[PDB]
């Protein structure tokens, strides 16, 4: 069963071959394909020896103007993943309920305890209510809920990765302001997300045909007159038989970047890469231990980790800063 997976992982170039296996229909977005693939397998939930409880869950937050297949990105991840659940934001915690059969006032499970090990697909993130907002943040940095309800005082477990998509205000994302303005979300919540992908639109002529032809053809072969087999068994296998290790040769390969970029960002109207970004980068370090079975930290996927952790930060920036920081780093990082 593995004997194939051995050489298939030893291709040394499984990255490209797996990226275009998720998002099977939707054309383009090989950018966000990368991030979501990073999220799917996950990372490594190491337990720090200083009693600090770092988490091993990658949470994503899409955003972009209406009509760009965000919801489809949610629905396909409903299928490909395992033990997944789903919800809209327009039930998040366990609540007292009168049983249909037994006629006793029991307690029923919510929507963040049914993903206690898998994924939680939130939709219409903006439409959440104040109680829902004050309840969602607790589970991010603690991953554990208490219920002192009418039923009884309990404290249960919730270890889920959150995959949600918000909307742009004014019916269109406009990149003059920062992303923290068009999202319409409380500020300490966006920090609880690792990746911040920003979806947009395009009127380029040569891609109009490329996308049209694809949709039209997908409407030609659906009506009554890496495939979906390798990667499902692969997310089952590669979830289990790896335990990525952590050496200390990369420990100084990054600080040389931070010392520069912190000044580069603070110089202008922005807050540089902070520790809650280094944590995301170091989490996505192992995100490729699951694809390659590599499990050893190398100066190769650190070029990838830093690249991604800046990819999800240059976009959420100002008008001329999203390009000034590019002219500096996108040419500096030697992409």
Restricting to residues 172-191, name those near another protein by CB under 8 A: 188, 191
CA distance 89 to 124: 5
Exposure on the CB side of residue 88, measured as CA atoms within 13 A: 3
Q: Is-contact 80 40, C-beta < 8 A?
A: yes
Burial-class residue 313 by CB neighbours within 10 Å (0-12, 13-18, 19+).
buried
Tell me how far, at minimum, the Cβ of 225 lies from another protein, in Å.
41
Burial-class residue 189 by CB neighbours within 10 Å (0-12, 13-18, 19+).
middle
Residue with tokens 């002192």: 148
Q: Is-contact 290 239, C-beta < 8 A?
A: yes
Among 152, 203, 206, 216, binds another protein (CB under 8 A): 152
> Does residue 274 touch another protein according to CB under 8 A?
yes
> Does residue 247 touch another protein according to CB under 8 A?
no
> Does residue 259 touch another protein according to CB under 8 A?
yes
Tell me how far, at minimum, the Cβ of 276 lies from another protein, in Å.
6
CA distance 131 to 148: 15
How many other CB atoms sit within 10 Å of the CB of residue 212? 11
Residue with tokens 């396909």: 76
> Does residue 51 touch another protein according to CB under 8 A?
yes
Q: Which is nearer to another protein, 146 or 228 (CB)?
A: 146
CA distance 40 to 80: 9
> Does residue 107 touch another protein according to CB under 8 A?
yes
> Does residue 207 touch another protein according to CB under 8 A?
no
Query: What is the SS3 assignment for 209?
Result: helix
How many other CB atoms sit within 10 Å of the CB of residue 130? 8
Q: Which is nearer to another protein, 49 or 205 (CB)?
A: 49
- Please name the residues in contact with 91: beta carbons below 8 A apart, sequence gap of 6 or more: 110, 111
User: x/- contact string, 296-335, with another protein (CB under 8 A)?
Assistant: ----------------------------------------
Among 209, 229, 252, 299, binds another protein (CB under 8 A): 252
> Does residue 263 touch another protein according to CB under 8 A?
yes
Q: Which is nearer to another protein, 23 or 120 (CB)?
A: 120
Among 13, 148, 176, 225, binds another protein (CB under 8 A): 148
CA distance 309 to 282: 9
71 is in an annotated binding site: yes
> Does residue 100 touch another protein according to CB under 8 A?
no
97 is in an annotated binding site: no
Which among 31-39, 68-76, 102-110, 171-179 is the span making contact with another protein, rule CB under 8 A? 102-110
The count of chain residues that interact with another protein, using the rule CB under 8 A, is 45
DSSP state of 157: E
CA distance 83 to 57: 15
Q: Which is nearer to another protein, 184 or 260 (CB)?
A: 260
**Residue 86: which H helix or E strand, with range?**
strand 85-88
Which among 6-14, 51-59, 160-168, 300-308 is the span making contact with another protein, rule CB under 8 A? 51-59
> Does residue 131 touch another protein according to CB under 8 A?
no
The gap between the terminal CA atoms of the chain, to the nearest Å, is 37
> Does residue 94 touch another protein according to CB under 8 A?
yes
Residues forming contacts to another protein in the complex (CB under 8 A) are 48-54, 94, 102, 107, 109, 114, 116-117, 134, 138, 141, 146-150, 152-154, 156-157, 188, 191, 251-252, 254-256, 258-260, 262-263, 266, 274-276, 278, 282
Give the residue numbers of the binding site for ADP. 71-72
């Amino acid at each position: 069963d593995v004997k194939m997976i051995t050489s298939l992982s030893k291709d040394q170039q499984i990255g490209e071959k797996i990226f275009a296996s998720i998002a099977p229909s939707i054309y383009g977005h090989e950018d966000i394909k990368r991030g979501l693939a990073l999220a799917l397998f996950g990372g490594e939930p190491k337990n720090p020896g200083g009693k600090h409880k770092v988490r091993g869950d990658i949470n994503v937050l899409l955003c972009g103007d209406p009509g760009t297949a965000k919801s489809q990105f949610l629905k396909y991840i409903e299928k490909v993943s395992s033990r997944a659940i789903f919800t809209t934001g327009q039930g998040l915690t366990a609540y007292v309920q009168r049983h249909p059969v037994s006629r006793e006032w029991t307690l029923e499970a919510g929507a963040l305890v049914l993903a206690d090990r898998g994924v939680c697909l939130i939709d219409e993130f903006d439409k959440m209510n104040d109680q829902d907002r004050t309840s969602i943040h607790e589970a991010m940095e603690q991953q554990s809920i208490s219920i002192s309800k009418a039923g009884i005082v309990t404290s249960l477990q919730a270890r889920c990765t959150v995959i949600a998509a918000a909307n742009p205000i004014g019916g269109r994302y406009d990149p003059s302001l920062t992303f923290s303005e068009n999202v319409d979300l409380t500020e300490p919540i966006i920090s609880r997300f690792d990746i911040l992908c920003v979806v947009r639109d395009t009127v380029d002529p040569v891609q109009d045909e490329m996308l049209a032809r694809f949709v039209v053809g997908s409407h030609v072969r659906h009506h009554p007159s890496l495939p979906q087999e390798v990667l499902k068994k692969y997310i089952i296998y590669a979830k289990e038989r790896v335990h990525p290790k952590l050496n200390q040769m990369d420990q100084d390969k990054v600080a040389k970047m931070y010392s520069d970029l912190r000044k580069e960002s603070m110089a202008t109207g922005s807050i540089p890469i902070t520790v809650r970004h280094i944590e995301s980068m170091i989490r996505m370090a192992e995100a490729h231990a699951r694809i390659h079975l590599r499990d050893y930290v190398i100066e190769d996927d650190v070029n990838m980790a830093i690249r991604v952790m800046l990819e999800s930060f240059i976009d959420t920036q100002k008008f001329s800063v999203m390009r000034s920081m590019r002219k500096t780093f996108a040419r500096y990082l030697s992409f």
